[PDB]
Amino acid sequence: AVPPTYADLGKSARDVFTKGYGFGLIKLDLKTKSENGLEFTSSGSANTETTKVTGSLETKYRWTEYGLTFTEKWNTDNTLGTEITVEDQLARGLKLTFDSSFSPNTGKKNAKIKTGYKREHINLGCDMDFDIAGPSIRGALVLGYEGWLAGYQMNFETAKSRVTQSNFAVGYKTDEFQLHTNVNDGTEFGGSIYQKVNKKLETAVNLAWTAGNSNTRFGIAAKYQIDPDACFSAKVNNSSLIGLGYTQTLKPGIKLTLSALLDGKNVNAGGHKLGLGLEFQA
Amino acid sequence: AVPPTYADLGKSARDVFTKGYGFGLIKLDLKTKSENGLEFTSSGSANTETTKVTGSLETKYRWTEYGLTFTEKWNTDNTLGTEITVEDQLARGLKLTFDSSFSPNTGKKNAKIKTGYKREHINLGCDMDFDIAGPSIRGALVLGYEGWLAGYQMNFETAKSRVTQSNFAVGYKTDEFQLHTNVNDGTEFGGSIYQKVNKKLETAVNLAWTAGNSNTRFGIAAKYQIDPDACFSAKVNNSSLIGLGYTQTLKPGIKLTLSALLDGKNVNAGGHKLGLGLEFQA
Structure with missing residues (x-):
């Protein structure tokens, strides 16, 4: 097989914990992809405690004839962004991205070049x-x-002329099972097991701990696809948090999510948090 | 005083009937705004009678130094739209709007120019x-x-080369009282009274009838601001429809509306129409 990128090691397990939940947020996600042409994605998020409202729109065109993608992004902080990608064009499995950012408000310019090479057994990248x-x-x-x-x-941060990040991961990956372990910076240790237990149930166990401290954090999570139209998520961690999430497809490509986060204390106050998400694909 | 535009004759009364109700819709709006800078709204609307779920984004920038507004709209059905507005710029009370619509999916283009001039006693417009x-x-x-x-x-429709619309209105307007009458096309007769009865109560009566039919339609409506956080609307018409609407600010910038439309008939056959609106304002 072609292996995942470094960032995607452990992603499935991470997904069982993160997807299906949006506590303290009202979320609106809109996607309109054309079989032959423009792709438009917008997200909008209200934080129900701070009354902050975030927004982003993205316009993305694939010229699938020349392995090209062009993207334009905009968010609520007036940050603008363009991204050009070439994939499979100079060689199979090579991918080159140029990414530029502009902030009219602040005049912050950023640019990035990201390069990726992948093939059987190997996945490399280098972002500048x-x-x-x-x-x-x-x-x-x-x-x-x-x-x-x-x-x-x-x-590597050039101004300090020093590696500021050094991460190792080891794992084992099938289509039904995933073991992931990592140590960041000789300091942060993590491990996860992911299991596709049947056609309807995914489970994940996560561990984390830190050099010099004897404590350990863990979480257990599940996702249960009740039928193709309804989906339940439940997770617990050893800080006493319980997360619940429910996703219902109302009509093809429209899904609605409710989620609750509950703490290990009283419930007659501002404890258990709520969330609501609506996702539309065209 | 500067009079309203032709379209805004009778608006207040119309507002008592239309605002605070959204029967057979579930609506979700998330908005953020800035005195200087962007204003942004993302919206989602489910029609519970058609099962149709709609999604929208809108971006507004007001450059109030040059009397400019730019507005940008996007929806699910692929429609895109821009509107540029210049006001007070060539002359006081002059307003010019440039409006374009585009469909990436239909190729459907629409363009409009709207011009307005207003001043003491006079309000004139011309839309192309x-x-x-x-x-x-x-x-x-x-x-x-x-x-x-x-x-x-x-x-004037240039393809038929003939006036296809000829409307007259006569009215009397104070800030606590409004009388409006109109006849469209020598055919549709209407009239309305609007009363701002006190700081907390608005009322409206509407009449409508049609040349060659002896019947008359009428509606009575109210809008009662209970306190600054809660708002009740009630309306009846002579088709036997009863509309109820209730708007509550749950937390500053979060408003919930419930509304019911009730027929004069049995309530055990599925004829009542419900609605729910949630607005989130940053």
Whole structure:
């Protein structure tokens, strides 16, 4: 197989915890993809406690004839963004992205070049961040061998002339099961198991702990596809948090989400938080 | 005083009937705004009778140094739209709007120029619709004299080369009282009284009837601001419809509306119409 990128090691397990829940938010997501042409994505988020409302729109065109993508982004902080991508064009599995950002308000310019090469057993990348703050280089390599996966990931900040990030991951990955472990910066240790237990049930267990501290954090989560139109998520962690999430397809490509976060204390006050999401695909 | 535009004759009364009700819709609006800068709204609307779920974004920038507004709209059905407005710029009370619509999916283009001039006693407008169907021109004039209002409104469709619309209105307007009458096309007769009865109560009566039919339609409506956070609307018409609407600010910038439309008939056969609106304002 072609292995995942370094960032995607452990992603499935991460998804069982993160998708299906949006506590303290009212979320609106709109997607309109054309079989032959423009793709439009907008997201809008109200935080129900701060009354803050966030927004972003994205326009993306695929010229699938020349392996090209052009994207334009806009958000609520007046941050503008363009991204050009070339994939599979100079060689199979090579991907080159130029990404530029502009902020009319502040005049903050950012540019990035991201390069990726992947093939059977190997997934490499190298991101370059051009900045006033200072250029940094992020490199990643994932090697795979009969279901096993080994990866290394680094960041170099040129102004401080020092690696400021050095991450290792080891894992094992099938289509029904995933083991992931990592240590960031010789300091943060993490592990996860992901299980596709049947056609209707996904489960995940997550662990995290830190050099020099004897405590351990863990979470257990599930996702149960009741039928093709309804989906229940439940998760607990050892800080005493319980998350619940329910997703209902109302009409093809329209889904509605309710979620509740509950704490390990009283319920006659501002404890258990709520969330609502509506997702529309065209 | 500067009189309203032709379209806004009778608006207040119309508002008592229309605002605070959304029967057979579930609506969700998330908005953020800035004195200097952007204003932004993303919207989602389910029609519970058609099962149709609609989604919208709108971006507004007011450059009030140059009398400019730019507005940008997007929806699910692929329609895009821009509106540029110049006001008070060539002369006091002059307003010019440039309006374009585009469909990435239909290829359907629409363009409009709307011009308005207003000043003491006079409000005149002229809208040009540059349609494939065919250009049409709408003109309007409203004169006022000591609280009285008289207006004429016409539309010319260039493909049929004939006036297809000829409307007269006569009215009397104070800030606590409004009388409006009109006849459209020598055919549709209407009239309305609006009363701001106190700081908390608005009332409206509407009449409508049609040449060659002896029947009359009428409606009575109220709008009662219970306190600054809660608002009740009630209306009845002589088709036996009862509308109820209730608007509550739950937290500053979060407003919930419930509304019911009830027939005069059995309530155990599925004829009542419900609605729910939630607005989130940053």
